[PDB]
Design a protein around this ligand. Structure first.
Ligand SMILES: *[C@@H]1O[C@H](CO)[C@@H](O[C@@H]2O[C@H](CO)[C@@H](O)[C@H](O)[C@H]2NC(C)=O)[C@H](O)[C@H]1NC(C)=O
Ligand SMILES: *[C@@H]1O[C@H](CO)[C@@H](O[C@@H]2O[C@H](CO)[C@@H](O)[C@H](O)[C@H]2NC(C)=O)[C@H](O)[C@H]1NC(C)=O
Length: 604
């Protein structure tokens, strides 16, 4: 009777299913959430009179069709097109080199070029139909507004670390962007993975390699599965043998099946439209005082910074620097940003061992946290490096833990305390000159959220034994040289978001935050908003499957160990405006100059 169905019964038309306004994760090219409010109250149609659109949506009829007879050769996977999200991946931003590189299309493309030494060629029929954009005058959604009125309450009850936790669930549900224009259409793509040596000799006839790749596309679609082709003349007998992989996908329209005339495919584009391109803006662009009218002025510029910080923390994590050049040695497969760490010489370093101390700040009774958090060296004894080494700091933070008393008088009431314990986690560095023995070996780390790539499980190898360093992490270590020399990998040092390692620039801003030359860096155990890394040189830690995207949240949910401070008056000093909250938690109205002076006396 109201909403969509009133416009749909009166008009008898389909609804356009390619709509903007929704969110967009930009690492994994997936769509999620609904940021903008789409209401169908005026019963608008497209100017064709064929679909039904929302009110705050205007369409531009493209009615365009592209048909190319040549494939485009896309070697060197570091710069690639996405064919569905090319306009939103290549924005001018500081993280343009990480966009798109966790989507499902990229992790397939990167694997087939390294595991086969291949290049890729796509050929496509584009069929762009509309361009669907949002108006500038537009309001936020009903559910997206509610979760910004919860970030702005924790920031005014003086609860940081809970407002950071809710701004990292905001990015989990609504992505990093908001699509502001989509493109309803339907492509038809064929990707081939040719062998890379097949292109190097055909420098002149590279225009004939692609001319047969675009003719093998049209014989696959037009003729049936039975080979009645017209392309097998001279060179489409090595081309069939030099290829390593082939697939054909369709994005809109009727489902593709091999042998369907290109006439018959293009008559199913109607009523089956998808976004074959999209553009967008960042997520914190839409947190501003004219999208949120009832909140105060400078309070939504602080929500916009808390949500901006959680997007930049989701791109700083999921960034793997390493040697990207494929023909070189020290090629890191998991790396998705070039570091310049190729062609470097390595130096074998020896490390003393890690240790850790606890302090047990608050809850000295009923919970004893300084047993689980404490760890000694395996080769020294107490909390110290051995004789020829030196300690560095690497991290220091607080481990909270809730418990329960129960004071019975039968009536009983229970009190919920919290027990804190600050832990400091050192590691040792070879100072001047150490002989070849008298040092622990290394067998890789494994956290509780990860695995050791020596044994492909959460376990140290044979002969090795773990020792705890950051309340979940286990460093596999053995002191032997006959039975533990098979699983030993050379070690380059820990560093963090604060303290870089001193093993770069030898014989020594403290230092840089990177590995020495020839070593690859790997993340291990993000521990409350700061990640610690470690440098190795194996090639076994390098290989394997590509890592999935590490989704937020990264902080554990806090234990509410901070009291709330009720804020009433909000002001800025530079234009003399004030927003006085009324009684019984109603709203934020603007402050008249006769009531704020009567309200500052009860504050301070
Ligand atoms: C607002 O919250 C912050 C964060 O907890 C408080 O800052 C800390 O307060 C404790 C209380 O003694 C101090 O020990 C810390 O040194 C403070 N940290 C910093 C960085 O200042 C702050 O006190 C709270 N403000 C109010 C009015 O409650
Ligand atoms: C991969 O491509 C190479 C071309 O770079 C093919 O090598 C040629 O194959 C033809 C087939 O008769 C020979 O006559 C040529 O002498 C080969 N060499 C060159 C330099 O052209 C190779 O055959 C292809 N791979 C497969 C498995 O067929």
């Amino acid at each position: 009777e109201v909403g969509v169905q009133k416009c749909k019964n009166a008009l008898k038309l389909p609804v356009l299913e390619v709509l903007p306004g929704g969110g967009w994760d930009n690492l994994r090219n997936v769509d999620m959430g609904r940021v903008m409010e789409l209401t169908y109250s005026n019963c608008r149609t497209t100017e064709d009179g064929q679909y039904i659109i929302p009110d705050e949506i205007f369409t531009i009829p493209q009615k365009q069709s592209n048909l190319e007879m040549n494939s485009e050769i896309l070697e060197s996977w570091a710069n690639y097109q996405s064919s569905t999200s090319y306009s939103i991946n290549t924005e001018l931003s500081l993280f343009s080199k990480v966009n798109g590189k966790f989507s499902t299309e990229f992790q397939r493309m990167k694997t087939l070029q390294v595991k086969d030494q291949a290049i890729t060629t796509r050929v496509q029929v584009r069929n762009l139909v509309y361009t669907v954009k949002i108006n500038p005058t537009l309001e936020l959604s009903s559910g997206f507004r509610k979760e910004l009125l919860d970030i702005s309450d924790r920031l005014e009850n003086n609860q940081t670390r809970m407002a950071t936790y809710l701004a990292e669930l905001l990015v989990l549900n609504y992505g990093t962007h908001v699509t502001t224009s989509v493109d309803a259409g339907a492509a038809l793509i064929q990707e081939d993975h040719l062998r890379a040596s097949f292109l190097q000799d055909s420098q002149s006839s590279r225009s004939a390699v692609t001319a047969s790749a675009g003719l093998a596309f049209q014989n696959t679609v037009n003729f049936k599965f039975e080979e009645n082709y017209t392309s097998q003349n001279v060179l489409t007998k090595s081309y069939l043998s030099n290829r390593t992989n082939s697939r054909v996908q369709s994005i809109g329209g009727v489902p593709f099946y091999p042998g369907i005339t290109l006439q018959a495919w293009q008559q199913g584009i109607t009523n089956h439209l998808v976004a074959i391109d999209r553009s967008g803006l960042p997520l914190h662009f839409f947190i501003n005082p004219n999208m949120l009218p009832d909140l105060p002025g400078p309070l939504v510029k602080k929500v916009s910074k808390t949500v901006e910080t959680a997007v930049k923390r989701y791109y700083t994590f999921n960034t793997y620097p390493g040697c990207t050049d494929l023909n070189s040695p020290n090629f890191n497969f998991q790396a998705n940003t070039d570091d310049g760490s190729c062609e470097g010489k390595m130096t074998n370093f020896s490390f003393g061992g890690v240790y850790q101390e606890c302090t047990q700040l608050s809850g000295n009774r009923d919970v004893l946290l300084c047993q689980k958090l404490e760890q000694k060296n395996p080769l020294t004894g107490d909390f110290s490096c051995p004789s020829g080494y030196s300690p560095v700091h690497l991290l220091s933070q607080i481990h909270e833990e809730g418990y329960n008393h129960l004071e019975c008088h039968t009536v009983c009431e229970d009190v919920f305390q919290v027990a804190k314990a600050e832990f400091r986690a050192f590691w040792c560095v070879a100072s001047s000159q150490v002989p070849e023995n008298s040092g622990l070996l290394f067998g890789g780390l494994f956290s509780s959220k990860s695995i050791n790539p020596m044994t492909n499980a959460q376990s140290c190898p044979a002969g090795y034994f773990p020792l705890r360093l950051f309340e979940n992490l286990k460093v596999c270590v053995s002191q032997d040289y006959e039975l533990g020399s098979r699983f030993a990998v050379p070690f380059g040092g820990f560093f963090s978001c604060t303290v870089g390692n001193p093993l770069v620039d030898p014989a020594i801003a403290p230092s840089l935050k990177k590995c020495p030359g020839g070593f690859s860096q790997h993340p291990a155990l993000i521990s409350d908003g700061c990640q610690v890394s470690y440098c190795v040189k194996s090639g076994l830690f390098t290989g394997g499957s590509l890592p999935p995207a590490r989704l937020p949240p990264f902080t554990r949910p806090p234990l509410m160990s901070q009291a709330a401070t009720n804020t009433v008056i909000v002001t800025n000093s530079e234009n003399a405006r004030s927003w006085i909250k009324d009684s019984q938690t109603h709203q934020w109205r603007l402050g008249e100059p006769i009531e704020l002076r009567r309200a500052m006396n009860v504050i301070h």
